[PDB]
Amino acid sequence: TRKGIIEGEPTCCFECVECPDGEYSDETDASACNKCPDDFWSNENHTSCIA
Amino acid sequence: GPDQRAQKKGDIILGGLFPIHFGVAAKDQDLKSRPESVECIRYNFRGFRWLQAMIFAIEEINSSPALLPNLTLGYRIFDTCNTVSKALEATLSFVAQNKIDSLNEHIPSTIAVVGATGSGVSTAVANLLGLFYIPQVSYASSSRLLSNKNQFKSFLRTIPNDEHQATAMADIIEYFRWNWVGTIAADDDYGRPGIEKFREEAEERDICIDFSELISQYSDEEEIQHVVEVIQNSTAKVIVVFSSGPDLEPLIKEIVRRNITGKIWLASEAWASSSLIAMPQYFHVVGGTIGFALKAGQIPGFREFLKKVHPRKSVHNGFAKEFWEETFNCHLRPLCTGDENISSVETPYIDYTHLRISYNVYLAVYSIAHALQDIYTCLPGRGLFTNGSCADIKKVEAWQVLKHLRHLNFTNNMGEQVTFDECGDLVGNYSIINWHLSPEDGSIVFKEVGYYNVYAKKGERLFINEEKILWSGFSREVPFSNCSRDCLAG
Amino acid sequence: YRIFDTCNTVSKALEATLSFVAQNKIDSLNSEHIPSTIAVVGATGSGVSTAVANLLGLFYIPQVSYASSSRLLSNKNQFKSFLRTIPNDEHQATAMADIIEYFRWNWVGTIAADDDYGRPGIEKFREEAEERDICIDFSELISQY
Amino acid sequence: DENISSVETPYIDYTHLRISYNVYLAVYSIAHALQDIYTCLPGRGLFTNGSCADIKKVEAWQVLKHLRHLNFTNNMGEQVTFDECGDLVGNYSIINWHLSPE
Ligand SMILES: *[C@@H]1O[C@H](CO)[C@@H](O[C@@H]2O[C@H](CO)[C@@H](O)[C@H](O)[C@H]2NC(C)=O)[C@H](O)[C@H]1NC(C)=O
Numbered sequence: 090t091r092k093g094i095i096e097g098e099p100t101c102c103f104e105c106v107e108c109p110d111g112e113y114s115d116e117t118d119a120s121a122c123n124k125c126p127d128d129f130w131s132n133e134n135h136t137s138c139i140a
Numbered sequence: 141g142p143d144q145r146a147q148k149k150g151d152i153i154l155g156g157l158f159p160i161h162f163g164v165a166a167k168d169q170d171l172k173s174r175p176e177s178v179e180c181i182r183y184n185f186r187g188f189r190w191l192q193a194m195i196f197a198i199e200e201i202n203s204s205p206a207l208l209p210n211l212t213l214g215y216r217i218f219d220t221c222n223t224v225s226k227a228l229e230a231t232l233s234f235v236a237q238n239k240i241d242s243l244n245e246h247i248p249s250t251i252a253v254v255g256a257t258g259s260g261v262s263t264a265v266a267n268l269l270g271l272f273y274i275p276q277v278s279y280a281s282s283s284r285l286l287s288n289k290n291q292f293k294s295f296l297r298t299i300p301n302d303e304h305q306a307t308a309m310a311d312i313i314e315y316f317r318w319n320w321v322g323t324i325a326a327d328d329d330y331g332r333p334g335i336e337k338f339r340e341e342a343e344e345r346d347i348c349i350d351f352s353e354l355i356s357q358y359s360d361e362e363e364i365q366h367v368v369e370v371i372q373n374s375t376a377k378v379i380v381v382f383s384s385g386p387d388l389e390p391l392i393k394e395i396v397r398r399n400i401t402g403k404i405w406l407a408s409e410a411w412a413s414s415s416l417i418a419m420p421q422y423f424h425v426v427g428g429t430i431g432f433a434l435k436a437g438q439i440p441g442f443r444e445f446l447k448k449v450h451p452r453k454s455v456h457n458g459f460a461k462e463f464w465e466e467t468f469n470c471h472l473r474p475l476c477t478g479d480e481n482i483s484s485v486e487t488p489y490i491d492y493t494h495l496r497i498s499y500n501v502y503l504a505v506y507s508i509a510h511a512l513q514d515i516y517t518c519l520p521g522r523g524l525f526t527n528g529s530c531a532d533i534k535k536v537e538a539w540q541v542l543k544h545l546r547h548l549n550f551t552n553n554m555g556e557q558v559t560f561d562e563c564g565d566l567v568g569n570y571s572i573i574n575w576h577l578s579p580e581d582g583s584i585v586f587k588e589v590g591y592y593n594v595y596a597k598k599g600e601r602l603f604i605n606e607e608k609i610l611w612s613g614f615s616r617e618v619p620f621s622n623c624s625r626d627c628l629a630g
Numbered sequence: 631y632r633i634f635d636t637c638n639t640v641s642k643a644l645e646a647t648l649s650f651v652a653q654n655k656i657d658s659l660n661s662e663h664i665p666s667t668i669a670v671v672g673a674t675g676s677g678v679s680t681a682v683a684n685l686l687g688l689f690y691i692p693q694v695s696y697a698s699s700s701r702l703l704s705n706k707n708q709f710k711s712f713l714r715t716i717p718n719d720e721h722q723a724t725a726m727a728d729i730i731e732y733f734r735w736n737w738v739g740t741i742a743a744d745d746d747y748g749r750p751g752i753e754k755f756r757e758e759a760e761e762r763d764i765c766i767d768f769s770e771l772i773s774q775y
Numbered sequence: 776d777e778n779i780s781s782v783e784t785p786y787i788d789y790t791h792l793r794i795s796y797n798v799y800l801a802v803y804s805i806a807h808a809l810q811d812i813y814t815c816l817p818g819r820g821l822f823t824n825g826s827c828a829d830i831k832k833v834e835a836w837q838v839l840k841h842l843r844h845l846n847f848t849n850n851m852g853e854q855v856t857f858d859e860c861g862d863l864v865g866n867y868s869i870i871n872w873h874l875s876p877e
Pocket residue numbers: 317318319345346620621622624625626
């Protein structure tokens with residue numbers, strides 16, 4: 090789950106936006122969902138990438 | 141007290157505090173010998189014009205019998221040199237009899253003081269004067285900190301407070317749709333509160349401030365270089381400078397040396413009309429600057445009185461000699477023949493387009509005079525004192541003048557009502573000007589491109605004509621001062 | 631010694647300081663019973679110390695304060711004769727920022743006194759928090775009045 | 776004849792001497808500047824041509840000069856000196872407000 094921006098409110102206040110399929114977020118307080126590499130997809134929880 | 145003064149004897153003495161010099165000699169006392177008096181440098185012709193405005197107003201009151209008949213206003217006017225120490229020497233001269241009476245014969249009793257220009261200088265002067273409840277009506281001290289009557293009991297001003305000006309800067313930034321600006325302020329009681337108010341307003345209006353740097357006229361080359369580095373590293377084209385001319389001159393000179401261009405300067409009223417910044421050879425840096433100016437006033441007969449100056453003819457103005465010696469580069473260095481024409485040398489003394497702080501000094505003097513008139517023309521049982529008792533104009537005291545100034549309501553020569561609210565403040569509009577290069581000459585023309593209506597409600601106070609703004613002095617395209625480009629559809 | 635009470639007020643402190651500088655004042659403004667104060671210990675408040683420092687450095691009378699810690703009193707251009715036995719408040723704002731960073735907070739509020747003490751310190755803390763990625767929800771100014 | 780210790784006020788009910796030590800240091804710093812004026816060798820002075828002030832007719836600016844060049848020792852054996860801005864850098868102690876069990 091990545092960090093989404095709340096308009097008009099500073100950076101410390103963010104929403105939790107679930108990563109889409111194909112991308113993933115492994116760490117906490119992540120500002121971007123990273124795409125799994127070639128020949129790799131994302132598991133159900135979007136916490137890692139499986140072949 | 142201090143010398144070089146301008147003094148006229150009268151039944152009632154009005155003190156004056158004007159910056160006839162832009163500053164003092166930067167010579168740090170090593171204390172190996174007894175510290176002598178510091179010298180004042182950088183002669184200010186605009187401050188001399190302000191002093192002449194005070195003298196002209198006092199002479200007008202002394203000539204017109206409709207105001208204060210058979211009562212003469214005198215003056216003791218000193219030079220502060222924008223320095224707290226000089227103005228404090230002058231203030232100690234003002235409170236000599238008062239401090240003798242309070243602590244411990246021919247010394248004049250200052251009934252009220254007109255000044256000073258700097259908010260820190262006026263703060264020190266108010267600290268000293270409020271001990272004796274001597275009214276002090278400033279003409280150019282617009283700091284919000286001076287609206288605290290618990291600390292400044294006897295302070296008044298004929299200039300608007302600078303919260304509206306910071307709100308106006310934020311409104312201007314919102315109008316042109318910028319969110320990525322940098323802030324610069326003088327490290328004094330004027331720049332700091334105003335830039336803080338601007339920061340609150342910008343946070344309210346969702347404007348990100350990249351850098352906030354403090355400046356001073358005594359800043360070392362290291363500090364100035366650091367501020368210039370901060371400006372260069374930043375991508376914020378718009379820089380909000382809430383400072384004065386002398387405090388911004390080192391930074392502007394250093395930036396001109398390194399040719400930083402494309403920066404949009406939002407000027408506070410202190411330096412938006414400054415001859416120390418609005419120089420023809422700085423236009424590739426400070427060109428297109430958008431600044432604020434106060435209401436322009438009219439003083440009929442003021443220009444003739446300004447042109448009637450003469451070192452020998454004017455015996456009550458000890459500043460006239462140095463004015464002559466710096467105007468014509470003469471000594472009374474070639475000798476001062478005394479027949480030189482004021483309309484021959486281009487100085488801010490005469491080459492003025494509007495009277496804004498001069499009108500403020502005029503209003504200060506007339507506010508004091510109308511308070512004295514209310515003291516004089518008062519029915520016995522309707523005075524502003526105990527049991528409706530009245531002050532005696534023959535033996536008037538400073539605190540009585542303060543009391544009548546708090547409840548003051550008089551009319552200008554422009555037909556505008558002048559009163560001071562519970563905070564001892566005056567409310568006034570603003571005119572938004574843009575620094576244009578002159579086609580005919582090389583001077584920096586201050587072109588009026590909008591206004592700010594303090595009486596209007598929020599969001600309707602600002603009015604700007606973008607067609608009249610030349611960005612950076614040459615460009616008609618509103619610059620881009622956002623941190624990131626707009627995210628498009630999808 | 632000649633010691634007066636300031637009552638945390640600029641007015642009382644300036645009356646006392648006018649007592650302090652009486653001989654220098656009459657010398658520079660034109661009875662030997664008036665004593666010559668060679669130096670002043672005080673004061674507590676930073677605004678009080680600012681006014682007293684203006685008046686005293688006018689006559690170059692040293693003033694060694696014990697509680698006034700405003701950074702504005704470190705300006706020797708304005709305050710030539712001011713000295714401190716208390717640390718400046720440049721470090722205390724940084725220390726508060728380090729405390730907030732240590733406990734892993736980023737959403738804080740700020741209150742300051744509306745005087746030469748609270749305002750510079752809270753500005754320095756705002757700068758340090760901005761450096762340390764701390765978001766300040768509100769900034770309020772208070773006073774005893 | 777009332778006993779000062781009978782009534783609990785911040786006058787005696789104190790645990791540490793923090794600002795009181797600051798007042799003590801201010802007084803002793805001025806005293807040590809005056810001593811440096813007094814213990815001044817004729818050719819070794821802070822004034823013009825290495826001249827020294829007269830302790831019997833000393834002036835405030837001379838004491839200011841000596842205070843700016845003052846480097847003495849506490850009663851705790853720690854050096855006190857003032858920087859170019861007349862500041863005395865020192866540590867801080869982080870304290871926590873608790874409630875007295877008794
Ligand atoms: C710079 O950023 C500001 C801040 O968002 C932009 O202002 C927005 O402009 C659009 C259309 O003009 C409005 O719908 C928004 O309400 C504005 N947001 C505000 C005022 O907070 C501005 O357009 C940007 N300028 C650019 C990218 O050139």
